[PDB]
């Protein structure tokens, strides 16, 4: 259960970083990277995360499968998107909203995707 697992890992977790007045989390499916019940990547039935791609071009969106909830090998389905910026934001927005797959992390995934894209694009002098 999400609430029980949160009451467990709320203060004791290997992803927790408490340093000077701030608290962060480093689990691999954590948009906004904060110690919260909403933005926890392990305790929910449905989770969406975004990362940079394997090569330095594009964004991989990983969502949690419904069925294999106790089998962590097959429990995540990830897709790489190497389009342009407006289409990748529109595609992940369509994915979240039209699947109705946890539609409160939508804008957080949007901010994270735009940050990853802007970091991926080449640096100007």
């Amino acid at each position: 259960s999400a609430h029980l697992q949160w009451m467990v890992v709320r203060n004791c977790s290997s992803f927790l970083i408490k340093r000077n007045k701030q608290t962060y989390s480093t689990e691999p499916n954590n948009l906004k990277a904060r110690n919260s019940f909403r933005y926890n990547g392990l305790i929910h039935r449905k989770t969406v995360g975004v990362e940079p791609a394997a090569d330095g071009k594009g964004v991989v969106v990983v969502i949690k499968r419904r069925s294999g909830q106790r089998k962590p090998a097959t429990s995540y389905v990830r897709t790489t998107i190497n389009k342009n910026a407006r289409a990748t934001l529109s595609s992940i927005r369509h994915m979240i909203r039209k699947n109705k797959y946890r539609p409160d992390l939508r804008m957080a995934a949007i901010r994270r995707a735009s940050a990853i894209l802007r970091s991926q694009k080449p640096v100007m002098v």
Partner: protein, 187 residues
């Protein structure tokens, strides 16, 4: 400057359980939501009793709850205690009951179930009756224990019946002067 005393400003009361029990914390969250967003004084009483300590939540006996359900007008109501249902071996037959408790001992639970009743926890109580309707809210005897036998006026005063603090019970342990008129005085 204003003339007020500040020694009674902070009210000494529980605002959360002292426990680190996560299941208790979860149902305190649930009943805190219910007491806030509901007009149920039942939910408010259940919340503050959830905050309370273990001595303030004495165990309720099965026979005592049988009597309080047997009281008139309480047919097919849900008996609710926030505390522990213990068994009473002094009662031979058990009627069917719909109880809700934080904790039920093994033999009390077996006796209720094989008598043919239902036992609820507080989450399924909130599913069944979220307002608290059709409930009888009991409690155990909060002043039945040995510390309350020892509290009160001092034992060497009249006319107190306060248990003294003696290291053994016998004819040599605090029965002389002060306890009978043939040794000084009696009071």
């Amino acid at each position: 400057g204003v003339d007020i005393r500040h020694n009674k400003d902070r009210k000494v009361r529980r605002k959360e359980p002292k426990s680190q029990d996560i299941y208790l914390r979860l149902l305190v969250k649930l009943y805190r939501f219910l007491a806030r967003r509901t007009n149920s004084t039942f939910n408010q009483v259940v919340l503050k009793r959830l905050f309370m300590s273990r001595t303030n939540r004495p165990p309720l006996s099965l026979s005592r709850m049988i009597r309080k359900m047997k009281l008139p007008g309480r047919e097919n109501k849900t008996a609710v205690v926030v505390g522990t249902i213990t068994d009473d071996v002094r009662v031979q037959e058990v009627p069917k009951l719909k109880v809700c408790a934080l904790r039920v001992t093994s033999r009390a639970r077996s006796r209720i179930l094989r008598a043919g009743g239902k036992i609820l926890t507080f989450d399924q109580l909130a599913l069944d009756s979220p307002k608290g309707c059709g409930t009888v809210l009991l409690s155990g005897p909060r002043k039945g224990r040995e510390v309350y036998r020892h509290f009160g006026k001092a034992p060497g005063t009249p006319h107190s019946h306060t248990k003294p603090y003696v290291r053994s019970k016998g004819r040599k342990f605090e029965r002389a002067r002060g306890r009978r008129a043939s040794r000084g005085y009696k009071n």
